Design a protein around this ligand. Structure first.
Ligand SMILES: Cc1cc2nc3c(=O)[nH]c(=O)nc-3n(C[C@H](O)[C@H](O)[C@H](O)COP(=O)(O)OP(=O)(O)OC[C@H]3O[C@@H](n4cnc5c(N)ncnc54)[C@H](O)[C@@H]3O)c2cc1C
Ligand SMILES: CN1CCC[C@H]1c1cccnc1
Length: 432
């Protein structure tokens, strides 16, 4: 008799949902978390006196799985105001910064987006079966820049949507797969307004950590923190999991939910399938990071795009007041473009967009540097989505979940919740 029935690896949303599924089944469930905190690529902290989100935290009811979880646990929405900006700006790869006044900005970006996903519906009638139509399979041969070039856009709108998709790719759009973007838009209802409503509009009452804690308290599982898994060995119709302090924990099955980019630091015995190995060594493309700045001046509601060779690719105002000053929430698609390491560099680069600003405070998360994320959100490279199956397939008594392994909203929390549900299904399968 092994130590536990099931061992979940990773205290993210995927792992939390899997642990809940298997605990409600009455299995002896243990969850191991490398970091000293739960939530994984979601993390609520505080800066300059207020609550902030260094990772994922915005959800929507058009996302079925996490919304069902919120319903089950009674978690309401918290709406961030995103109405009538005071200044919308677009910075180009050459450093040019032009202030467009909102409505024109918004409608030209709508044009660029809709023409980018012109064939979304036909290519993806079933967003949850990404490669149902094989025309999506053939489009996975293409980049998103490949179609951006063939859509004949404005220079303004080309810059807009290319910075958008560089954010979504955590990379340069030349490496960004096309079918992933099209499928994500499909899941959103093939509609620009509805899909955009699921961007940075609604957060979870009590926070992503609130939902994580609800799921974990419910599951009844044992949660160990600051316990990294370094190796897994399938033996004896079960599995042995090795921690970084060389302790062995036996289980009937293990559900791996740690990000793809980190699989390279876990040794599997015997070796995983060849497609799984290829995926593990490729990983995914996103190299983003989160950054909050706080400057003396009040700049009101503000939004700003920046294309892929500028650093502060996504910028919006978190809060504003004549006395407090201004707080800038910012997402960077690639950490090699700006090192939030440097308050000098952050001040320089934000002054390039809001000339004459006094930087009071800085707070940053470099997800690319974190050993247990080695990247940000899921972002498929060219040709990856079409073989997603290899990453999903269970290998013996080893089950694989995680946002990157989901079929629907792969680039956000919902993908992780769906991963966990599927993992629980497979666990029930192999333990009944
Ligand atoms: C800046 C940013 C903004 C985002 N915005 C949103 C958003 O607004 N809305 C949204 O829905 N999603 C958003 N996303 C996506 C989102 O936060 C993630 O997709 C989601 O958390 C995926 O969860 P996961 O379980 O699949 O993986 P993770 O949450 O990363 O879970 C992996 C866990 O495994 C652990 N781990 C790794 N290696 C080991 C090991 N060897 N042993 C033990 N444990 C290990 C890690 O510590 C981590 O806790 C955002 C992400 C980022 C980074
Ligand atoms: C949650 N999204 C998934 C793709 C990129 C990420 C995102 C969206 C908006 C602002 N910052 C990050």
């Amino acid at each position: 008799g092994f130590d536990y029935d099931v061992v979940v690896v990773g205290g993210g949303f995927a792992g939390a949902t899997a642990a809940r599924e298997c605990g409600l089944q009455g299995y002896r469930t243990l969850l191991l978390e490398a970091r000293s905190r739960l939530g994984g690529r979601t993390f609520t902290s505080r800066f300059a006196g207020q609550e902030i989100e260094f990772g994922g935290a915005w959800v929507h009811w058009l996302q079925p799985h996490v919304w069902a979880e919120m319903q089950r646990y009674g978690l309401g929405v918290v709406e961030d105001p995103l109405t009538n900006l005071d200044k919308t700006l677009i910075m180009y790869n050459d450093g040019s910064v032009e202030s467009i006044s909102p409505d024109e900005f918004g409608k030209n970006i709508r044009i660029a987006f809709e023409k980018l996903c012109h064939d979304a519906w036909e290519v993806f009638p079933r967003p949850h079966e990404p490669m149902f139509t094989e025309r999506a399979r053939e489009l996975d041969k293409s980049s998103v820049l490949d179609r951006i070039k063939t859509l004949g856009l404005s220079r303004l709108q080309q810059a807009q949507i290319n910075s958008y998709m560089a954010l979504y790719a955590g990379e340069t759009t030349d490496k960004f797969g096309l079918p992933g973007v099209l499928k994500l838009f499909a899941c959103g209802g093939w509609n620009y307004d509805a899909f955009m409503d699921t961007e940075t509009h609604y957060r979870i009452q009590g926070g992503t950590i609130g939902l994580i804690n609800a799921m974990l308290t419910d599951s009844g599982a044992e949660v160990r923190m600051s316990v990294p898994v370094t190796a897994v060995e399938q033996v004896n119709g079960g599995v042995k999991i090795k921690t970084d302090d060389d302790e062995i924990i036996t289980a009937g099955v293990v559900v791996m939910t740690v990000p793809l980019n980190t699989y390279k630091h876990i040794g599997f015995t015997p070796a995983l399938s060849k497609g799984k190995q290829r995926f593990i060594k490729e990983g995914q493309l996103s190299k983003g990071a989160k950054l909050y700045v706080h400057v003396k001046q009040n700049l009101g509601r503000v939004f700003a795009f920046a294309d892929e060779q500028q650093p502060l690719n996504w910028v919006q105002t978190h809060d504003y007041s004549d006395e407090l000053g201004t707080i800038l929430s910012i997402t960077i698609a690639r950490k090699e473009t700006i090192d939030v390491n440097d308050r000098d560099a952050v001040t320089r680069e934000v002054q390039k967009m809001f000339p004459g600003v006094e930087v009071l405070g800085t707070a940053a998360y470099d997800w690319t540097a974190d050993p247990f994320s080695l990247g940000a959100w899921a972002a498929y490279g060219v040709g990856q989505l079409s073989r997603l199956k290899d990453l999903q397939a269970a290998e013996g008594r080893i089950l694989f979940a995680g946002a990157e392994t989901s079929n629907g909203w792969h680039a956000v929390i919902d993908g992780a919740v769906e991963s966990g549900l599927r993992a629980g299904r497979e666990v029930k399968q192999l333990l009944s």
